[PDB]
């Protein structure tokens, strides 16, 4: 089982890719007198918003 983790991590192009995200935040919270500069439908884990 050390392969199934580690080499898939190192060389993911070598394996089937579930490249498209599957986990997301809710919509970003609103500010008083402000807005999120970029709107979007999808907010993947690790995405920044400004």
């Amino acid at each position: 089982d050390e392969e199934l983790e580690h080499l898939r991590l190192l060389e993911p192009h070598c394996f089937p890719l579930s490249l498209v995200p599957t986990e997301f935040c809710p919509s970003p919270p609103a500010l008083k007198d402000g807005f999120v500069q970029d709107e979007g439908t999808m907010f993947p884990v690790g995405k920044n918003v400004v």
Binding site: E11, P12, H13, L17, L19, V20, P21, P44, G46, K47, N48, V50
Partner: protein, 156 residues
């Protein structure tokens, strides 16, 4: 070696800059997706930014991601980050290269109301403050005044 790619990027990433990274692939017909990512170096653990890009004849197999390095996400401290991994990942290829990064982001045009002043004067001074994107930066700025002997006299 018909199936090939080019990812092209600025010679140096500017911290905080919005950097547009373009990708072209050749010898492909099935449409597929890639991700271009900016990752901590050498450990690749933290990801500063990532962009999903879709490639198809509908795009003539060309696309770009807009990726950025928000300055607080760098670890900072006494040792600033010199280098960062640019990465691309696809069904067909994975590669990463050590890009250099630079913190030189934008322009600080000092304008003094005159070039010459007598003693018994106050200078009026103001600074025009612009991003790399040449937009008004809206950033805290600090002035330091040095005498002709090279002695610091004031900071504000």
């Amino acid at each position: 070696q018909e199936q090939t790619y080019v990812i092209s990027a600025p010679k140096i990433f500017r911290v905080g800059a919005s950097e547009n990274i373009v990708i072209q692939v050749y010898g492909y017909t099935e449409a597929f997706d890639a991700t271009i990512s900016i990752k901590s170096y050498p450990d690749k653990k933290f990801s500063y930014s990532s962009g999903h890009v879709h490639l198809s004849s509908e795009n003539k197999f060309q696309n770009s991601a807009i990726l950025t390095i928000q300055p607080k996400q760098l670890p900072g401290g006494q040792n600033p980050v010199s280098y960062v991994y640019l990465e691309v990942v696809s069904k067909h290829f994975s590669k990463s290269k050590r890009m250099p990064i630079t913190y030189d982001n934008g322009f600080l045009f000092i304008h003094t109301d005159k070039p010459v002043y007598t003693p018994d004067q106050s200078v009026k001074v103001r600074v025009y403050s612009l991003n790399d994107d040449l937009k008004p930066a809206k950033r805290e700025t600090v002035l330091t005044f040095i005498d002709p002997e090279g002695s610091e006299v004031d900071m504000v």
